[PDB]
Each structure stands twice: as structure tokens, then as C-alpha cells.
Amino acid sequence: MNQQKSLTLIVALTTSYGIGRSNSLPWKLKKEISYFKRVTSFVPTFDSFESMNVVLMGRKTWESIPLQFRPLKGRINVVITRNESLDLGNGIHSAKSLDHALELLYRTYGSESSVQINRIFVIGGAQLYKAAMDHPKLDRIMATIIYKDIHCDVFFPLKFRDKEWSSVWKKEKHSDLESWVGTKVPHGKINEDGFDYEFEMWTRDL
Ligand SMILES: NC(=O)C1=CN([C@@H]2O[C@H](COP(=O)(O)OP(=O)(O)OC[C@H]3O[C@@H](n4cnc5c(N)ncnc54)[C@H](OP(=O)(O)O)[C@@H]3O)[C@@H](O)[C@H]2O)C=CC1
Ligand SMILES: CN(Cc1coc2nc(N)nc(N)c12)c1ccc(C(=O)N[C@@H](CCC(=O)O)C(=O)O)cc1
């Protein structure tokens, strides 16, 4: 009872691995955020009945979610926090680490629940990305790449797209991405108020 399913990571990072700035998102990518929403909510219709996805985030990302958009709707949220004094949420779990999170869900959401889980996502930030990257169940990176050098204070832990990791991490066909995400997605670059971006799916053999 601990690790059964895979772990998917999802990020928006610039060519230089910058993922944030001043504990915040230094860019307004409203359709980028719809991809996000889209991706993280998607459950196959036949399963659309009992099944839900799980979004894992570090304490800081949680604070970065507008009160308006918290918890993420249609998804099980789990905030990773050691410094859990008292989390504040009506069915918004608090795990002390990534594997603890994973046995809480497995514990709290099994056969005896009218609520199941399909997919689990690590939706950030930096430190949580780090531990996701070392976890033996992480095999897929749903990354959005912005072709703009935006000054970021926090960087993505592993340079997964670079040549040094090019024997592990492979970028899948646009086809594979869409199928996985179940719905069609923009191919090529998407310009949205200044930044040039694009969607990619990286996969690794566990
Ligand atoms: N591009 C993107 O998709 C995203 C970018 N970001 C950016 O990342 C930055 C925040 O990064 P980061 O500072 O790392 O924040 P995180 O959101 O990862 O918060 C880290 C905090 O969360 C808890 N935590 C995280 N990992 C662990 C672990 N392995 N064990 C225990 N507790 C853990 C701890 O909380 P405690 O203090 O309780 O120990 C730790 O201080 C901001 O710039 C944010 O905007 C964030 C999300 C998505
Ligand atoms: C800081 N993070 C991470 C984040 C933003 O964009 C990303 N894009 C990717 N690819 N991965 C990520 N992890 C993120 C987030 C911040 C806010 C929301 C958020 O509010 N989404 C709400 C808001 C709804 C809306 O704005 O439309 C939702 O319901 O999905 C999500 C993530």
C-alpha cells in the first residue's frame, strides 16, 4: 500500500528552466492555465463516474492559488507539508511528504470509497518537483515550454530536455500527447500576450 500508479509532473518553464519568480508566476498564460485545468481534470468518460485525478503541490504553490480557485475543482488536492500545524480545508489533505501523501490517498481512497482516483499529478513547485524527480514512480513530464527568457528566481530541478538526460527522457509524438490527454491540443507554438510557448510530453522507463 504505497505506490501503484504512476506520477505525472506538470509544469510551465522557460528554455532556461525558470518556473517562477518571487514565489509567483511571472507570466499571464490564461490559455496555458486552461491546458492545465483541462489536463488535470481529464478522466475518461466511462470512468467519469467514480474517478477523480489527484493534484499534489507544495505549501507555497497552495498559497499561490487565488482564494477564488482553491481547492482546484474536480480534483483531489493534497498539500505536501512537514510544517503542518493545522492545514485549513474541508477535505484538503495534508501529507508530510510525497510518499505519505501517496498512502493517505491509497488509505483514504480505496475500494471502500465511492470515490476513486485515476491520475495523480505533481503540480509544483520547485522542492516538490525535486522529490518527484527522485521518486521511482515518476515517468511522465507534461511540460509547457516558453520561448522567452523570463527572469525567474526558482528553477526546475532536473534539466530533463538536455542532452545529458537524453537517454532517459524522451519527448513523445504530438499524437501520444493528445491521446494521453484524451483531447486534441495545439501543435506548434502558441503566442499569448508576448510569450511564445508550446506543450510537450517527456517520458522515462522506470
Ligand atoms: N511553473 C509551475 O508550474 C509552477 C511553479 N511554481 C513556483 O515554485 C516556487 C515555489 O517553489 P518552492 O519554493 O519549492 O515551493 P513549493 O510550492 O514546492 O513549497 C515548498 C514547501 O512545501 C513543502 N514541501 C515541498 N516539498 C517538500 C518535501 N519534499 N518534503 C516536505 N515538505 C515539502 C514544505 O513546506 P513547509 O514550509 O511546510 O516545510 C516546503 O517549504 C514559486 O516561484 C512558485 O510560483 C509553483 C508551482 C507550479
Ligand atoms: C502556480 N500554479 C501552477 C501552474 C500554473 O500554471 C501551470 N502550468 C503548468 N503547466 N503547470 C503548472 N503546475 C502550472 C497554479 C496556480 C494557479 C492555478 C489555478 O488557479 N488554476 C485554477 C484557476 C482557474 C482559472 O484560472 O481558470 C483552476 O481551477 O485550475 C493553478 C496552478
CATH code of the domain in which 105 resides: 3.40.430.10
What residues contact 54, with CB distance under 8 A and at least 6 apart? 75, 76, 77, 78, 105, 117, 119, 120, 121
Closest CA to 130 of 17, 1, 6, 2: 17
Q: In the chain, what is the greatest distance between 2 CA atoms, to the nearest angstrom? A: 49
> 114: domain range?
1-206
CB 12 less than 6 A from any atom of ligand 2: yes
CA of 47 to the centre of ligand 1 (A): 31
Quick check: 78 and 53 in contact, CB under 8 A? no
Q: Across the chain, how many H-helices and E-strands are there?
A: 5, 11
Give me the resolution in angstroms, 1 decimal: 2.3
- Counting ligands in written order, the one closest to the CA of 74 is 2
Cα dihedral sign, 67-19-142-56 = negative
Q: Which three cell numbers stand for residue 96?
A: 508530510
Catalytic residue IDs: 25, 32
Neighbours of 190 (CB within 10 A): 18
- In degrees, rounded to 5, the angle at the alpha carbon of residue 18 between the alpha carbons of residues 14 and 22 is 130
Which residue shows C-alpha cell 532536473?
Answer: 158
Cis check: omega of the bond before 157, within 30 degrees of 0: no
CB 145 less than 6 A from any atom of ligand 2: no
CB 25 less than 6 A from any atom of ligand 1: yes
Going by alpha carbons, the residue nearest to atom 14 of ligand 2 is 11
H or E element that contains 47: none
d(CA 116, CA 71): 18
Q: Which residues are annotated as a binding site for NADP(+)?
A: 12, 18-24, 59-61, 81-83, 124-131
Closest CA to 125 of 58, 34, 203: 58
Burial class (CB in 10 A: 0-12, 13-18, 19+), 149: exposed
d(CA 122, CA 120): 7
- For the chain, what is the domain count? 1
